[PDB]
């Protein structure tokens, strides 16, 4: 029985990925920051379906130190991975899904806002994933060959549309670019350990409708395939496949799940 | 019971892709050019496993005219797709797998230059274009209520063409053209819900490998075909116009 | 005095590139297909400004045979490059600019064969043969008598990754041209022949979408980049593309 | 006389870029962190060649607060740009060249890692971001009637990051982020006519702190010339992208790698 660690697993795409992996037989460590209620509800559902098949761990993945000597992001990430080993004695899959997403305009309080966004946006999207991957790899390396799993797989949730930047989201876009870099670098360095590292990049998935219906419909209408945003499963299914043994030759690449959105022009 | 058309399905990756799809329940149209024996042997196996689940069609996919007025590549491609409709009344998946691959050095005749161009460009790019056109036309001509629910076109590309193989310019160009076809076809065919994606192996079933970061070996046919099968599945119904490299990290290397 | 061969040099970008190179001191071979008048007018201007600094040569770059044994595209391409050597004894720069551009819809008949040969010929196959002919001549030239700055520019397209609805063949041909750039650069490196691409977005339209200036570009705004890539200051650049699209390729629908 | 701000301008490519721009008529603000001597020697040369055509500014571009309330990286970046306006009343070109480069292996303390992250990410990505922000803020605050006619930002990226260098994850990531900054900044800053492009060297003025045969093997891998590039072979491209003849280019990268990124193992 393999174990998967999914960050930001409480709702939306994170939950779908956790459910997807759980359906495949994985025990799942559900990470969360502020959504304790949803995360615990998910753990309860999964555990009821299969005893001892889900746990939850809380952690701010922003690049800042927390209250205990202050606790660093790295430590917090190492503990995330450790929680898996302590509870199930293993960690086969890591999905870097947690991510902050808000505007950081270059054009037009301001001090803490700019410094907090950087740590938050870059922490969740890039730096935490880096430390998490490091911790994940250190545990595999420290495991005697004969006792290692046969299918280690790390999935980085990237973004199919960052090459056509979203106006006013520079830091987020930068962090995603860094995450793409982490995928390529990690794949290469971790190859000898047979740890595959790939990226999955959604375009528009379960789009939040905090706007006039016509503006919500207009956005969806842009996606060439189906003229709609995707469902959570339409993304998570791809994540699950990349984690399957049938994908054991794939590493260091990205799979876009955008219904052709990245093919469009203004 | 859906139908898949697989060009160059006689051996290696093509055969694995055909077997893969067949295992999923697809009736398979096995195209071939010169490998009649192997194609028929594959058909026999597949048919024995499941009656009327496989057929074979021969066709030179090079960009030239053949003997019947002369028959053009387009016609030959249209007849390929037609064979599916004539036999099973449908064609849900098209896998552009057939491909010539040999050197066309820029640095050191006339006949072998024009034959290579038509051959390398035909199989890798032009035939796939015509095949996609024929495929789309048949779907468009089908009344909505009678259409399939999962049309998928897979273009077998190359994960290493951005790091060209010395001396293989035409092939490399043809592959680039196939990449363009993937993006263009995906966009144009979206309204008809026909997804178009690419699968790019790096080193698969080499008849060099120590340079592959993952496993330090070329891949097996299944390691590639499984990806093709997944992209054809309904679980991949939101993926279109993209490429999936199956290279074990080879495209990440430098000299 | 170096020589530059510019295909489709009669008007628009081709003409601007030819003028740009000529301004840098290049003798220019202006290729054309149907635009004889404009090409000859340009030659006259350039020749008046500097005697024996321009010539014009006609050639269909479509992948078809033409009547003088039928003449193939390769031969026609080889003669294009040869014309330069015959007249000036050299060919330092080749700019693959000539290009057909029209719809080949997949949804709603030899016109498919004429389009294929035309769109693929001008955009990809002719460039391939031209590069081949160009490289041969350099290789056949004794080291001591070779130029010091061989440069091949392939006019590509900054927007083909975001295909233009209904232009599949053209888009494919451009993808092949991109492939030719990378392959040619690698193979021709030992001969010090640099091969790069320049990809305009919207230039000299026959708009409000272009993030930069909200307008298509002028011909000079593209050709200047072609000229720089041909200069000695760019001697370490090869196998890459420079987009000249004012940020258009950064947009979404 | 237009002004160019060049980070890490003391030596190597930074110096070449500064010299290049200076040769084009630009007054140059030479930024440096540790190389005061080299930077001041360069300022002297440029100033002798043309009075009041160069100044130096020191600043740690790592993502850490410094001693004067502690001073943040943003403030330090804002002061860098300000120094240009205070001295010459303008800032037309910004070249994000400063960059840390060392291994951060994934496979086998507290200070070295936290310090590496802030350093590698600060110089390569975050400082560039703040610098661009500050640069854009001052242009926006300038009345259209007093604005320059050729604002240009160049981000020094890396032509080989897509084929990562074993053991350099953070650096590679930071470069990826810099690439994202280029695309995002180009789009957002288009209305102000501020072009943003990248220049990515492959192997330039390769350090020879190794056995000659090893150093030669490394260069031999580059398809064109079989050698690393000179500083000018890179800087000349930066200067071209900053010229008015490149006014339609924005949001793109120009590889200066002699075909290195075309190779396989
Ligand atoms: N949905 C879409 O259209 C697209 C999504 N993506 C990518 O897919 C992934 C998932 O998408 P989606 O479901 O929309 O993501 P969400 O926006 O819904 O956020 C996912 C989770 O990330 C967690 N998170 C955010 N910041 C932090 C942080 N500072 N520390 C720890 N956890 C944090 C949150 O957990 P909690 O609630 O517990 O606080 C949140 O639930 C993301 O990485 C995203 O970048 C890419 C393109 C498009
Ligand atoms: N194998 C690898 O390491 C790599 C493969 N690829 C791509 O994957 C795909 C399959 O690879 P692989 O199995 O090795 O392919 P093969 O080289 O084994 O050839 C596949 C088939 O293509 C057919 N074919 C060749 N030329 C023509 C033509 N003129 N007209 C009609 N059919 C033709 C042949 O059919 P027949 O024998 O019946 O005549 C052949 O069996 C190809 O598209 C290839 O480009 C990409 C990268 C690497
Ligand atoms: N303009 C733009 O917005 C864009 C242009 N580009 C590329 O830049 C390059 C130049 O652009 P532009 O000036 O608009 O090009 P044009 O469309 O104006 O065509 C250039 C020339 O190509 C020649 N040509 C066309 N077909 C053939 C053929 N079958 N055989 C020989 N010559 C042929 C024509 O020569 P003649 O008139 O003598 O017959 C024509 O003058 C092209 O490669 C184009 O693809 C890319 C993106 C955008
Ligand atoms: N040279 C090459 O082969 C390649 C270079 N590049 C890129 O090109 C650019 C220039 O290359 P190169 O000349 O080799 O760069 P260098 O490695 O020589 O360093 C450039 C300068 O960056 C400054 N710097 C480093 N860290 C900081 C920091 N923490 N805060 C402030 N300044 C800092 C240093 O200034 P000081 O000495 O004053 O402390 C140094 O002089 C870099 O961005 C590099 O990433 C990309 C690929 C290859
Ligand atoms: C907002 C949002 C979420 N999204 C998707 C999106 C992307 C990344 C994410 N990342 C994370 N962590 N969480 C998310 O919820 C998330 C959501 C959108 C992105 C782009 C467009 C879009 O293309 N709109 C037009 C805007 C037109 C205009 O303003 O001129 C465009 O073409 O840019 C719409 C929605
Ligand atoms: C030959 C062959 C089969 N192959 C695989 C290959 C690729 C595409 C195909 N395409 C098709 N249609 N059929 C094939 O059988 C096929 C096989 C190889 C490809 C690359 C290297 C390689 O990387 N060589 C060296 C140097 C490459 C270079 O010249 O730059 C290296 O990098 O290690 C070796 C073998
Ligand atoms: C037509 C034409 C010429 N052109 C420019 C163009 C491009 C390549 C060429 N290539 C050649 N050889 N000759 C040309 O004259 C030429 C001209 C255009 C290209 C794109 C759009 C455009 O982006 N239109 C839509 C998007 C279309 C889509 O989404 O598919 C938009 O909304 O902006 C408009 C005009
Ligand atoms: C180191 C370094 C600096 N560099 C160049 C480089 C890149 C970015 C920089 N960035 C910054 N800021 N400063 C620099 O001095 C700098 C230097 C190199 C990069 C790649 C290889 C290389 O091709 N390595 C081969 C090794 C081959 C082998 O030994 O088997 C490889 O496969 O990766 C060598 C040197």
What's the structural blueprint in terms of helices and strands?
The structure is a homotetramer.
Chain A: E1 3-6, H1 12-23, E2 27-32, H2 36-49, E3 54-58, H3 73-88, E4 93-96, H4 110-141, E5 152-157, H5 170-190, E6 195-202, H6 213-222, H7 232-243, E7 254-257
Parallel strand pairs in A: 1-2, 1-4, 2-3, 4-5, 5-6, 6-7
Helix pairs in contact in A: 1-7, 3-4, 4-5
Bound molecules: NADPH dihydro-nicotinamide-adenine-dinucleotide phosphate (4 copies) and 10-propargyl-5,8-dideazafolic acid (CB3) (4 copies).
Provide a short characterization of the protein structure.
The structure is a homotetramer. Chain A contains seven helices and seven strands; from the N terminus they run βαβαβαβαβαβααβ. The first copy, chain A, is α/β, with parallel strands linked by helices and about 270 residues long.
